[PDB]
Each structure stands twice: as structure tokens, then as C-alpha cells.
Design an enzyme around this catalytic site. Structure first.
Site, short mmCIF file in Angstrom:
data_model
loop_
_atom_site.label_atom_id
_atom_site.label_comp_id
_atom_site.label_asym_id
_atom_site.label_seq_id
_atom_site.Cartn_x
_atom_site.Cartn_y
_atom_site.Cartn_z
N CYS A 81 -16.22 6.63 3.31
CA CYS A 81 -17.39 6.23 4.11
C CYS A 81 -17.32 6.68 5.56
N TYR A 138 -23.23 11.67 -5.44
CA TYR A 138 -23.53 11.51 -4.02
C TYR A 138 -22.44 12.12 -3.14
N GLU A 193 -42.29 0.36 8.92
CA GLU A 193 -43.54 -0.41 8.81
C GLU A 193 -44.43 0.07 7.68
N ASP A 197 0.83 -1.21 0.00
CA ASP A 197 0.00 0.00 0.00
C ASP A 197 0.86 1.26 0.00
N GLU A 242 -23.54 14.88 -0.38
CA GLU A 242 -23.30 14.55 1.02
C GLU A 242 -22.40 15.60 1.69
N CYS A 292 -12.28 4.32 1.78
CA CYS A 292 -13.37 4.31 2.76
C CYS A 292 -12.90 4.76 4.14
N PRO A 331 -15.14 8.93 7.60
CA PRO A 331 -15.22 10.33 8.03
C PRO A 331 -16.46 11.04 7.49
N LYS A 332 -16.97 10.67 6.31
CA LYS A 332 -18.12 11.42 5.82
C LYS A 332 -19.37 11.10 6.65
N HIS A 342 -44.55 -1.49 15.17
CA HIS A 342 -45.11 -0.17 15.48
C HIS A 342 -44.57 0.37 16.80
N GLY A 368 -27.93 8.46 -12.77
CA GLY A 368 -27.91 7.02 -12.59
C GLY A 368 -28.78 6.50 -11.46
C1 LIG Z 1 -48.01 0.86 27.77
C2 LIG Z 1 -48.28 0.11 26.48
C3 LIG Z 1 -47.40 0.24 25.41
C4 LIG Z 1 -47.61 -0.45 24.22
N1 LIG Z 1 -46.69 -0.28 23.17
C5 LIG Z 1 -46.92 -0.93 22.04
C6 LIG Z 1 -45.96 -0.76 20.94
O1 LIG Z 1 -44.94 -0.06 20.95
N2 LIG Z 1 -46.31 -1.48 19.79
C7 LIG Z 1 -47.42 -2.31 19.64
O2 LIG Z 1 -47.59 -2.89 18.56
N3 LIG Z 1 -48.30 -2.46 20.68
C8 LIG Z 1 -48.05 -1.80 21.82
N4 LIG Z 1 -48.94 -1.95 22.87
C9 LIG Z 1 -50.10 -2.83 22.67
C10 LIG Z 1 -51.23 -2.16 21.90
O3 LIG Z 1 -51.62 -0.97 22.59
C11 LIG Z 1 -52.41 -3.12 21.81
O4 LIG Z 1 -51.99 -4.36 21.24
C12 LIG Z 1 -53.58 -2.56 20.99
O5 LIG Z 1 -53.97 -1.27 21.47
C13 LIG Z 1 -54.76 -3.51 21.03
O6 LIG Z 1 -55.82 -2.96 20.25
P1 LIG Z 1 -57.32 -3.38 20.49
O7 LIG Z 1 -58.09 -2.81 19.30
O8 LIG Z 1 -57.34 -4.86 20.72
O9 LIG Z 1 -57.79 -2.63 21.82
P2 LIG Z 1 -57.67 -1.14 22.37
O10 LIG Z 1 -56.68 -0.38 21.56
O11 LIG Z 1 -57.39 -1.29 23.87
O12 LIG Z 1 -59.14 -0.50 22.12
C14 LIG Z 1 -60.32 -1.03 22.76
C15 LIG Z 1 -61.22 0.15 23.07
O13 LIG Z 1 -62.57 -0.31 23.39
C16 LIG Z 1 -63.00 0.38 24.55
N5 LIG Z 1 -64.05 -0.40 25.21
C17 LIG Z 1 -63.88 -1.38 26.16
N6 LIG Z 1 -65.00 -1.92 26.57
C18 LIG Z 1 -65.98 -1.24 25.86
C19 LIG Z 1 -67.39 -1.34 25.83
N7 LIG Z 1 -68.08 -2.20 26.59
N8 LIG Z 1 -68.07 -0.52 25.00
C20 LIG Z 1 -67.38 0.34 24.24
N9 LIG Z 1 -66.05 0.52 24.17
C21 LIG Z 1 -65.41 -0.31 25.01
C22 LIG Z 1 -61.73 0.57 25.37
O14 LIG Z 1 -61.91 1.56 26.38
C23 LIG Z 1 -60.77 1.00 24.26
O15 LIG Z 1 -60.89 2.38 23.94
C24 LIG Z 1 -48.74 -1.27 24.09
C25 LIG Z 1 -49.63 -1.39 25.16
C26 LIG Z 1 -49.41 -0.72 26.36
C27 LIG Z 1 -50.39 -0.88 27.50
C1 LIG Z 2 -16.07 10.50 -0.35
C2 LIG Z 2 -16.42 9.04 -0.53
C3 LIG Z 2 -17.44 8.48 0.24
C4 LIG Z 2 -17.77 7.12 0.11
N1 LIG Z 2 -18.79 6.61 0.89
C5 LIG Z 2 -19.13 5.36 0.72
C6 LIG Z 2 -20.17 4.82 1.59
O1 LIG Z 2 -20.79 5.43 2.46
N2 LIG Z 2 -20.42 3.46 1.37
C7 LIG Z 2 -19.76 2.64 0.43
O2 LIG Z 2 -20.09 1.45 0.34
N3 LIG Z 2 -18.78 3.17 -0.35
C8 LIG Z 2 -18.49 4.46 -0.21
N4 LIG Z 2 -17.48 4.98 -0.98
C9 LIG Z 2 -16.79 4.09 -1.94
C10 LIG Z 2 -15.68 3.27 -1.29
O3 LIG Z 2 -14.75 4.15 -0.65
C11 LIG Z 2 -14.95 2.44 -2.35
O4 LIG Z 2 -15.88 1.65 -3.08
C12 LIG Z 2 -13.88 1.51 -1.76
O5 LIG Z 2 -12.98 2.23 -0.92
C13 LIG Z 2 -13.12 0.79 -2.86
O6 LIG Z 2 -12.14 -0.08 -2.27
P1 LIG Z 2 -10.93 -0.62 -3.11
O7 LIG Z 2 -10.24 -1.74 -2.32
O8 LIG Z 2 -11.47 -0.91 -4.50
O9 LIG Z 2 -9.93 0.62 -3.19
P2 LIG Z 2 -9.41 1.65 -2.11
O10 LIG Z 2 -10.20 1.52 -0.85
O11 LIG Z 2 -9.35 3.00 -2.80
O12 LIG Z 2 -7.90 1.19 -1.81
C14 LIG Z 2 -6.89 1.17 -2.85
C15 LIG Z 2 -5.57 1.46 -2.17
O13 LIG Z 2 -4.46 1.10 -3.04
C16 LIG Z 2 -3.52 2.17 -3.01
N5 LIG Z 2 -2.71 2.13 -4.23
C17 LIG Z 2 -2.99 2.69 -5.45
N6 LIG Z 2 -2.08 2.47 -6.37
C18 LIG Z 2 -1.12 1.72 -5.70
C19 LIG Z 2 0.11 1.17 -6.11
N7 LIG Z 2 0.61 1.30 -7.35
N8 LIG Z 2 0.83 0.47 -5.19
C20 LIG Z 2 0.34 0.35 -3.96
N9 LIG Z 2 -0.81 0.82 -3.46
C21 LIG Z 2 -1.50 1.50 -4.38
C22 LIG Z 2 -4.37 3.42 -2.84
O14 LIG Z 2 -3.59 4.53 -2.42
C23 LIG Z 2 -5.36 2.92 -1.78
O15 LIG Z 2 -4.81 2.99 -0.47
C24 LIG Z 2 -17.08 6.33 -0.83
C25 LIG Z 2 -16.08 6.90 -1.61
C26 LIG Z 2 -15.75 8.25 -1.47
C27 LIG Z 2 -14.64 8.83 -2.33
#
Ligand SMILES: Cc1cc2nc3c(=O)[nH]c(=O)nc-3n(C[C@H](O)[C@H](O)[C@H](O)COP(=O)(O)OP(=O)(O)OC[C@H]3O[C@@H](n4cnc5c(N)ncnc54)[C@H](O)[C@@H]3O)c2cc1C
Ligand SMILES: Cc1cc2nc3c(=O)[nH]c(=O)nc-3n(C[C@H](O)[C@H](O)[C@H](O)COP(=O)(O)OP(=O)(O)OC[C@H]3O[C@@H](n4cnc5c(N)ncnc54)[C@H](O)[C@@H]3O)c2cc1C
Ligand SMILES: NC(=O)N1CCN(c2ccc(F)cc2)CC1
Ligand SMILES: NC(=O)N1CCN(c2ccc(F)cc2)CC1
Lengths: 588, 588
Positions: free
Chosen positions: B154, B291, B571, B132, B295, B149, B156-157, B566, B318
Site C-alpha cells: 500500500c 489491481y 456531489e 517476524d 497499478e 503493506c 510505496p505503491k 459544490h 472479480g
Molecule cells: C465569492 C463567492 C463564492 C461562493 N462560493 C460558493 C461555493 O463554493 N459553494 C456554494 O455552494 N456557494 C457558494 N457561494 C454562494 C452561491 O453563489 C449562492 O448561494 C448562489 O449563487 C445563490 O443563488 P441564487 O439563485 O439565490 O442567486 P444568484 O446566483 O445570485 O442569481 C440571482 C440573479 O438574479 C439577478 N437579478 C437580480 N435582481 C434582478 C431583477 N430585478 N430582475 C432580473 N434579474 C435580477 C442577479 O443579477 C443574478 O444574476 C459563493 C458566493 C460568493 C459571493
Molecule cells: C503490491 C500490493 C499493494 C497493496 N495495496 C493495498 C492497498 O492500497 N490497500 C489495502 O488495503 N491493501 C493493499 N494490499 C494488501 C495488504 O498489503 C494486505 O492485505 C496486508 O498486508 C495483509 O496483512 P497481514 O497481517 O495479513 O500480512 P502481512 O502484512 O503480509 O504480514 C505478514 C508478515 O509475517 C511474516 N511471516 C511469514 N511467515 C512467517 C513465519 N513463519 N514466522 C515469522 N514471520 C513470518 C511475513 O514475512 C510478513 O512480514 C496490497 C498488497 C500488495 C502486494
């Protein structure tokens, strides 16, 4: 086969038109229905495999086999000439509106599942009512339309999780060259609660607008099924009445449990109360070890609180226990205290909540450890998160005949049907299903289409992905490692794993070997991926896409031949190679 | 079939043992080999379906059909008795080190592909050298081991992108209840660069440690292939010598282009210089629309800079052009200025860079728009991002016979072989391949295994996912919409799409309908997903997992039957339903 599908579709659809995309008499009928604002389902026979067979089966209901046939609530109404006759004589509106019931569909419960079902049914012309009521908590907390997730669940808890995550973003920013001083910054609980509640309020209002714009009747009333087709309703004035419906969807959800000990109901709170609490909880005890318990303790500690969690046995019972332990270890190193193998015996009040000056009270918690030693300590707030349960005796008269299981959940067929032919159940009260908001929504929408549009697709409840939004997040799809080993035997299970470090953590001087991921695979089935697990930032965004591949039966070779995106956390899944059997360290 | 594989494997492996997991004589030989510290490939015949056929084929080389059989550089060495004879007579070490060349493998280029190839080959016993060298930029910038990279790409950017993202996290924090004042906080460029460069330095050192611990010879020298097996090296004292190798891997990468205009080389910089610049660039012009250009302009604007981008024709040529336009619109609404349809004619120097007080100079840029009107404006820094190119007439004597295409990249077979049978090329110089770091790493590791361990697996270059880390990130996998329509016709293409809003943006009052996603599908192939596109936060974490499903042939039905997690951004892919043909709005 075809004939049984057609019979079921005709009997259950509210308004349905059998059609072909290529027929101007079809188009002529469609335009009449549109102008009269009559919503309906449509089946285009020219775009189905056996549409020719369906065309012949229709004659058993209409005595005709031709293009244009419109049905209402199981009854043949006419071909093109006949429909236009009814339109020209102003008879059509009364025909499409006559029914032996007030509604084609009554939804009891206005939450995740119920609102999705009701809006979808109405799109095909089903006359629909949605009932929702919120029984207040013991301290009086109540909220608006939308269910548990919108008001007291996924939405507010992830917003407060984000407020907690921003504390480390403030810390990180100094290392990336920003001039703030994290040590001099504080958090205002009530400012955050106000912003969270304004968003929830825009969701309550959005749902009411959505129902109105779909012509769904919204009743803010408690519903009770007293016979297969009769629902008794009680409103805010305790006025009682009865409405009838053809199909019924039960969607009433669950509420938090309290343990059977002195002072719990009187002096503690639950997650129902926490998300609108007008004062900061202060020094807080969380009793329980569910994802609800750990998510709430996690963000309270990130917002500067003094937080303790009381664990009866294990963390996250039912999840992979290696991953659960890594989740808890991170929380314990970042502030959260744990009282392990411990349960509460009683809560005593020392100070009443200061509703004037907006301050918590003060409590004495007494308990004991599993070996008999004693627990005694004071807290300002005590939060119970010891599970949730339905209360179907409130909702469902026992004489109707809907069968429940030993936990009080509704026993359903794989198409959500109960033991009463016209009654269905969706969401958290459907026995044995994952209790998640996207599951309830899919179940509700797919059911409405089967009832009112002749669809056949069922909801698939297997391998549904999850994410626990603890301070370091945990995403999963499929089996835990211990469940896979129990089902197939240890010799047939291979586990690939690795630690990793987010690039974002390097300049910020965060931990080298805390994030972790693994794939649990079955050797005798081409190294099929049985379960995927990741602990790290943005774990829900990482996990989601892999759920599609696991649904299609991904193997380890599928992960290997797919190329990573760099630089990301997720790309570590594409190059895993250390196996647990080998004993080689997973650190990096 | 089996016999051609076996001959190829024996001829090119450095040290290889044919074995069975169940044979104690094989175990006896394995134990001897690593006590003497002899690394080697192993092939366990009982683990392969046609192991019985391979076992018979070995007799064509050894005259025996039993296991173990050990080979060195194409020559049968012995069975168990014979290997042990060589061991206890201290003859083994000289046998395994006997070679017609200095090295089994010389890698020219120490970057992403070359380091991966070299480390993997040494694991199977290949005696390996990695060369190298970093040719300095016009202003003198150079860096350490690891390639583009690691040092100027990749890594530092994305760290600088994160510094920019943290400015909006500071803004968001106030809305979530934190007491800081965003308007009173500033950014220190040199503090950021010091932290970035310290991480890069730990990567430089880690790679040198890795090569030492794999017994790889690292030469900080410029390499030149002068015949199929002969590499001329020039070190940092201009001392010149020759080394020989059996197999050669070219992995030398590319460097940035400058336009052929006065002042460009003298007074402008490229991305090679930006990531270690000792002063903040100040008011900046970026020439180009790749890009890299977008970026760099993006994070400079988020860090408080006054930034303009001068675009010859279109953004992100492209890539899907609807998505490119959304990326740029976001950038322009958040401060980046764009000089559209414009190219530069000359750079004039007004002030020299102030190396003492650590300040940029000052430049006058003159250019013109495609209709003929004039561009003229002053800037403190001018960054060229107008493409990258190899310079193989520097690595490769024309008399060796390695064929290049019209762009100067190496023409290779699907196993990376050049037109010279022992010489291979990987990474950015391999014509026609995606120019990405994980592709180069996969190509290098897989090639090393075919050369030295008998593997057969090829690198798959199709449907490799990407992410552009602009201020709002853009992830993609598969075809753009316009490419899909060109290939299959508009009537065979269906596009599902939706806007979305991250939940994190609600309380922070960010934009309602800027994030966007779509699936481009083929109607006549069961709605196969041809391309996936998303614009939003954490877009690379979102996209990665779906690339496994697309590799496996996912359809729209596969997305529909998988359930969402959720609340997440990802999702939204599981419930898409609005088609472009329908004309219904994608807003939420
Ligand atoms: C703290 C907490 C966090 C959660 N976080 C997540 C999460 O991040 N992701 C996820 O996917 N799930 C999460 N859940 C689960 C999610 O809330 C439940 O799976 C979902 O709300 C169930 O929907 P449901 O329609 O069965 O009932 P509900 O959403 O409970 O609705 C039933 C409704 O019917 C009403 N009701 C009840 N009895 C009667 C009646 N006799 N007459 C009329 N209305 C009535 C109730 O008061 C209520 O308003 C979480 C639950 C809790 C408690
Ligand atoms: C600004 C920027 C951002 C990027 N961001 C991303 C990203 O987020 N994700 C991603 O997947 N790709 C990204 N890429 C692309 C990625 O950097 C390249 O696809 C990857 O580094 C290619 O690897 P390589 O082994 O082909 O060559 P390189 O990683 O370039 O390595 C080749 C090496 O050989 C050395 N060399 C050259 N000639 C000689 C020689 N005669 N003798 C000895 N050594 C030599 C060079 O100096 C270098 O050190 C980015 C590129 C740039 C420029
Ligand atoms: N005693 C009872 O059976 N409840 C029924 C529900 N409740 C009610 C309250 C508010 C609201 F908006 C709708 C209904 C009134 C009293
Ligand atoms: N062909 C030449 O004229 N060489 C190119 C290599 N170069 C060098 C510099 C630093 C280093 F560490 C290794 C090599 C010196 C000049």
C-alpha cells in the site's frame, strides 16, 4: 387528504394526464400529445398506494372515473375519444395554449435557483419565462447569464484556488524525483484570468442553449413585481412593458456590501470585480473575515502576492471556532498577514489605476484597533468582503404584500410560499436558509415539481454540509462543538478527535500535525454524531459521503463498524478513539 | 447467557479487575496496580445493564459478591484487603507473573494484523511476543518490520502513484498561468526510490519503538507451530529453540506467485522487488491483470516508461466489469499497451543486469494468444503479478490439527477461531475474507479485546469498500452490477448513472466524458443501494464516507434528500436520475 392533494394538483398543473401504464387508450393519447409536441405531466395511477381512491376523486372534476383524463390549467379537457376529436379537427393546439396569463411561470432572476426552477417547470408543459439582468458594479463590471456562483463565485474562486494549489504541487514534485526548480518559476495573472473567463463564457452560452432547447423564453431585462400576477420589465434600451403570469418565483440573489466610510466605493473593489480583473492586484488588503475573505486572501498569497487581512473580531463567525482558528493559523504560517481586532476608517487615493499599461493604482488605508491604537499602511488593491445583502425594494413593490424580515429577506412557508399565495421565493433571499448553490437548485427543482407535476416532496434544509476552500480546506456537516454544548450541556457531549498526516505529505516534507478531524457526539442518544469537522486536503470530497450517513442518523458505533479504505485521509474517521475529556494528546 | 460470558472472560484474561466507578476501594486497588506498573483490563459493573447479574455470578469463582475482585489467568486473587496484603509484603509481583506458559500470547507474523493484535493485547496486561521474519526474494531482496503493506505494498505503491500524478499536475500548471515548460522536465527514478525508502525506514523504526513502549517482546525469527501451545523459533544464526504461549494468533500473510515457465524465477521480478529497485526498469512488460498489475503499469507509464501489460483473459477479475473496462481504456489512451488474450511461454536472457553502472539487463519474451498466434518481443524488465499465496506448510505442522481449505488458507469461525481451540488466524490467511490492510487491523484489535478484556464485538466483513489506484482511480463499495443481477434478477435491479467532469479539468483541457459513477439498487427493497462505483480523481476520498451510509442501509431516497457540496466531484452522487433502462445517455 387524497381529495385535497388532487384539487391542488389539478388547479396548478399546466397540462396533466391521469393514466395507467397498462391501458392502450392511455398510450394512444400519449402518442398524440408527443406527435403534436405538447409537453405535459403524467400520473400513473396503477403505481400509487391510493390510486384507486384518486380514480374516484377525479369524478368531482370530470364526472367520469375511467382511464385517460387530460386537464389543462384546471379544466377537464376530455377522455380518449374527445382528445382525438380535437386533434382530428385541429382544435387541440388552441385548447392547450389558452390561458388567462401570458405565462404559467415567471422566474425573476437567472441564477442557481432560478434557472433550475425554470428548466424543471418547462419539462411538464408550463409556459415559462426567465428574467435576468446584472446591475454593474461601481467600476462598471458586468457579466452574462448564470448568477453569482457561475460568474463571480464558486466556479472562478475554486479555479483560482486550484491555481494556488498547483504551486505546492510544483514544490512537491522535486521531492518525488522531478527535475524542475520551483524557485525559478513565476505566475502570470492575466493568463489565468483568460482561461477562467473562457470557461465562464462557455457556461453563459450553455445556459442560453439549455433555455432555448426547453422552450423557455429568456428576457435579458430587469423585472419588478407590481401586483400578484403582473411583472414590469425594463430592457437594455430602457423600454418598459408588462407581462403576466400565474405563478411567480423570486430568485434574485444578493450583492456585496460596502462599509460606510470615505473612499470605499470610489477606490476599493469586491469579489464581483476580482474574478475578471485585467491586472494583478499586487500588494493587497482584504477587509473582512468571512469565507469569501479568507478564500480570496489564500489564493492571492499562493499566487505570489503580498496579502494582509483586516479582522474586526473573529474569523468565520458562525462556524466552529476551534476549526476557524486552525484555518487562520495555517494561512499565517504560509504567508498571510493578519491585522487583528481592527477596522478601517478611510481610503485615500495616491495613484489612479493605469488602464493603459495594465497596472493597479496605489492607496493609503487608515484605521484603528479595538483599544484605540492607529493603523496606517499603503496598498495597491483593497478588497471589501464584509457581507452580502438583497435589494428587494428594487424588485418588489411594497403594495403587493410580500412580507420581509428585518434583514430584507422573504419570509416563507416550508414549501417556499410567500404571504401572497401565487408567489414563491428560493435561494439566498429565502429568510433563514443556508445560502448555498446546491440548496437553491434543490429548492427550485423540487418546487417546480410540486407546482406542475403534483409532487409532494419538500426540500430538507437541515445538516447541509459545507466546505471552505482556504489553502488548507475545511469541511463540516452539522453542529459546531460550541453549539452542541450550548444545546445539550457539556456533560452530555463527547468529542473524539485526532491529528493526521496525508501520505502525500511524507516524501514532500510537509507538516506532521496540522491536519485535524473530530466527531461531536451526544452521549444520551446512543452517541449520535451531531457534527463532523475535517481540516485537510480534498476536504469537500472527504465530507460529502458522510453527509448521507448523518442524514440517516449515524452514531459513533456506525463509524466504528465501517472499515476504512487504505491509504486515504478519510479513513481516519473510522478509527477515532481519543476523547477530549480524557486529556490524551491527539497528535500522531 | 451472562454466566457463559463471565466464565469465558475470567478463563482467558491475563489480569482483570471487576469494579465500579463509584467505589473508593476499587480506586484504592487501581492506584496500587499502576504504581507497581501492572497493566490490566477493567470492567465497571455499574456501566452495564446486567451488572447486577454479573456481580452475583462472580461468586461462583470467588465465593464473594462485592467489588473489587481481581483475577490472574483464571484464578481469583483477592478483594481490596488481600491485594494490599500481597503488595505491602512484596508478594504481588510474583502473583501477577505466575503462568503455566512463557507468554499469554504469541503472534506469528509482524505485519498489519499481527502488530495491531499484539499491541492491543499488551494494553490489557497480556504478556506478548511478536515474531517476524522476511524470507528473501529469489534475487535476494528483504526488508524490515511491518509487513507487506508498509514495505512492498500500500505505502510505496501509493507514493509512486503520487509521483505519477504530479506529472499531469506539471502539465496542468501551464494552463493555470505558471511559466514552466513541461516538455523540458524529466524524472529521476533513484531519487524517488530514495525518498520512498527513507519513509519506509521511519515506519520500520516506529514499529520497533512501539513494541518496546508496550512491553512487547519482538523476535526477528521464523516461527513454526509444532503443537497447540509450542512455537519453534529459528533466528538469523540458524539457532533453534522453543517458546510456549496460552493463545496463538497466526498472521503470516502471503507472497507473490511465479508461473511455471522457464526463465521466470531467474530473470523476472515481482512487486516485492520493484519498490526498492536500484535502477529504472526501462522498457517493461507486466504479466497479469490484477489491481497490483494495473497499478504498477500505470505509474511506470506516468514516469516516462514504455510499458506493456499481457492479459490472460480479463482485467480486474472479480470487480464490476464495466468499470474495469473503463479503467483500462483510460490507461490505453494514455500510453499503456495491452497484449490481450495472451500468456507467456518462456523468458530468455540477452543481457545480465549491470550492477555497476546501475542498469537493467535485457530479455526476450515468447508467448502465444488464445487462437494460437505467436508473441515475441524484447524487454528490459519483466514483472510478474499473477496472484499471491500463503505457504502455511512452513508455519504449521500438520499434526497440530489446524484445518486448511483447498487454497491453503485457514478455516475459521466468525470469531477467527481455528479448529484448535486456543489458536486463531487473522488477515490474508483467513479463508474467505477480503484481503485488505484495514480489515486485518480491525480483526486483530477486536480479537485481542475479546481474548483479554471481555469484549464481545465481532469484525463485520460485509460491504467493505475498496479503491484501485490506477492513473484514473476506481472506488467501490458493495456489489458489482452483474453480481446484483445474478442474485435478484434483472427486473428487480435499477441502475442510476452519469458521466462527470472535474472542475479542475476544465481550464486544463482534459477529457469531457471519461469520469463516471453509478448506483446499483434493488427495486423491491425500497431502492436499497446494493453497490456504489466511481471512476475519477481522489476516488478513495470520495467513496469512504458513503461506506458508512451503505453499512446503515442507505436507499436512493437517502441520497436524494442529502444536499451536495459544490464544487466537488462527489456531489454528483446526490442528484443522479438517468436510469440504464431508460436508454437516455449518461453524457453531460
Ligand atoms: C465569492 C463567492 C463564492 C461562493 N462560493 C460558493 C461555493 O463554493 N459553494 C456554494 O455552494 N456557494 C457558494 N457561494 C454562494 C452561491 O453563489 C449562492 O448561494 C448562489 O449563487 C445563490 O443563488 P441564487 O439563485 O439565490 O442567486 P444568484 O446566483 O445570485 O442569481 C440571482 C440573479 O438574479 C439577478 N437579478 C437580480 N435582481 C434582478 C431583477 N430585478 N430582475 C432580473 N434579474 C435580477 C442577479 O443579477 C443574478 O444574476 C459563493 C458566493 C460568493 C459571493
Ligand atoms: C503490491 C500490493 C499493494 C497493496 N495495496 C493495498 C492497498 O492500497 N490497500 C489495502 O488495503 N491493501 C493493499 N494490499 C494488501 C495488504 O498489503 C494486505 O492485505 C496486508 O498486508 C495483509 O496483512 P497481514 O497481517 O495479513 O500480512 P502481512 O502484512 O503480509 O504480514 C505478514 C508478515 O509475517 C511474516 N511471516 C511469514 N511467515 C512467517 C513465519 N513463519 N514466522 C515469522 N514471520 C513470518 C511475513 O514475512 C510478513 O512480514 C496490497 C498488497 C500488495 C502486494
Ligand atoms: N434604468 C433602469 O431601470 N435600468 C434597467 C436595467 N438596464 C438593463 C441593462 C442591460 C440589460 F441587458 C438589461 C437591462 C437598463 C436600465
Ligand atoms: N529455517 C531457516 O533455515 N532459517 C529461517 C530464518 N532465517 C532468518 C534470517 C534472518 C533473520 F533475521 C531471522 C531468521 C535463517 C534461516
Amino acid at each position: 387528504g387524497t381529495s385535497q392533494w388532487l384539487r391542488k394538483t389539478v388547479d396548478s398543473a399546466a397540462v396533466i394526464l391521469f393514466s395507467k401504464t397498462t391501458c392502450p387508450y392511455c398510450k394512444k393519447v400519449k402518442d398524440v400529445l408527443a406527435e403534436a409536441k405538447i409537453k405535459h405531466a403524467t400520473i400513473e395511477l396503477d403505481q400509487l398506494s391510493n390510486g384507486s381512491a384518486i380514480q374516484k376523486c377525479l369524478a368531482s372534476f370530470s364526472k367520469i372515473e375511467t382511464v385517460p383524463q387530460m386537464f389543462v390549467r384546471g379544466k377537464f379537457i376530455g377522455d380518449s375519444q374527445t382528445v382525438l376529436k380535437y386533434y382530428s379537427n385541429d382544435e387541440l393546439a388552441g385548447i392547450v395554449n389558452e390561458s388567462k396569463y401570458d405565462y404559467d411561470l415567471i422566474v425573476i432572476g437567472g441564477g442557481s435557483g432560478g434557472l433550475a426552477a425554470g428548466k424543471e417547470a418547462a419539462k411538464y408543459g408550463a409556459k415559462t419565462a426567465v428574467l435576468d439582468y446584472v446591475e454593474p458594479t461601481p467600476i462598471g463590471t458586468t457579466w452574462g447569464l448564470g448568477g453569482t456562483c457561475v460568474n463571480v463565485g464558486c466556479i472562478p474562486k475554486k479555479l483560482m484556488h486550484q491555481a494556488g494549489l498547483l504551486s505546492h504541487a510544483l514544490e512537491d514534485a522535486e521531492h518525488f524525483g522531478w527535475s524542475l526548480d520551483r524557485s525559478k518559476i513565476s505566475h502570470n495573472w492575466s493568463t489565468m484570468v483568460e482561461g477562467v473567463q473562457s470557461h465562464i463564457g462557455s457556461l453563459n452560452w450553455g445556459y442560453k442553449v439549455a433555455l432555448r432547447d426547453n422552450q423557455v423564453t429568456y428576457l435579458n431585462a430587469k423585472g419588478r413585481l407590481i401586483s400578484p400576477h403582473e411583472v414590469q420589465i425594463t430592457d437594455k434600451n430602457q423600454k418598459v412593458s408588462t407581462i403576466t403570469g400565474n405563478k411567480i418565483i423570486l430568485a434574485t440573489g444578493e450583492r456585496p456590501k460596502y462599509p460606510e466610510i470615505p473612499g470605499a466605493v470610489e477606490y476599493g473593489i469586491t469579489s464581483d470585480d476580482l474574478f475578471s480583473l485585467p491586472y494583478f492586484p499586487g500588494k493587497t488588503l482584504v477587509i473582512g473575515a468571512s469565507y469569501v475573505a479568507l478564500e480570496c486572501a489564500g489564493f492571492l498569497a499562493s499566487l505570489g502576492g503580498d496579502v494582509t487581512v483586516m479582522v474586526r473580531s473573529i474569523l468565520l463567525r458562525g462556524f466552529d471556532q476551534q476549526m476557524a482558528e486552525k484555518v487562520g493559523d495555517y494561512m499565517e504560517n504560509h504567508g498571510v498577514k493578519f491585522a487583528k481586532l481592527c477596522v478601517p476608517d478611510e481610503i485615500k487615493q495616491l495613484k489612479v489605476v493605469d488602464t493603459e499599461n495594465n497596472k493597479p493604482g496605489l492607496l493609503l488605508v487608515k484605521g484603528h484597533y479595538t483599544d484605540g491604537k492607529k493603523f496606517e499602511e499603503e496598498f495597491e488593491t483593497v478588497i471589501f468582503a464584509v457581507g452580502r445583502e438583497p435589494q428587494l425594494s428594487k424588485v418588489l413593490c411594497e403594495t403587493v404584500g410580500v412580507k420581509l424580515d428585518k434583514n430584507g429577506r422573504v419570509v416563507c412557508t416550508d414549501d417556499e410560499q410567500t404571504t401572497v399565495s401565487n408567489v414563491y421565493a428560493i435561494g439566498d433571499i429565502n429568510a433563514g436558509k443556508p445560502q448555498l448553490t446546491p440548496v437553491a437548485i434543490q429548492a427550485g427543482r423540487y418546487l417546480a415539481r410540486r407546482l406542475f407535476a403534483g409532487a409532494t416532496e419538500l426540500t430538507d434544509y437541515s445538516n447541509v454540509a459545507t466546505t471552505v476552500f482556504t489553502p488548507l480546506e475545511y469541511g463540516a456537516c452539522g453542529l459546531s462543538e460550541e453549539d452542541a454544548i450550548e444545546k445539550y450541556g457539556d456533560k452530555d457531549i463527547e468529542v473524539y478527535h485526532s491529528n493526521f498526516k496525508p501520505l502525500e505529505w511524507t516524501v514532500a516534507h510537509r507538516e506532521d500535525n496540522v491536519c485535524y478531524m473530530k466527531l461531536v457526539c451526544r452521549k444520551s442518544d446512543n452517541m449520535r454524531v451531531l457534527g463532523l469537522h475535517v481540516l485537510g486536503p480534498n476536504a469537500g470530497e472527504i465530507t460529502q459521503g458522510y453527509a448521507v450517513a448523518i442524514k440517516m442518523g449515524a452514531t459513533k458505533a456506525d463509524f466504528d463498524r465501517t472499515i476504512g479504505i487504505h491509504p486515504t485521509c478519510s479513513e481516519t474517521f473510522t478509527t477515532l478513539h481519543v476523547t477530549k475529556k480524557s486529556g490524551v494528546s491527539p497528535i500522531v
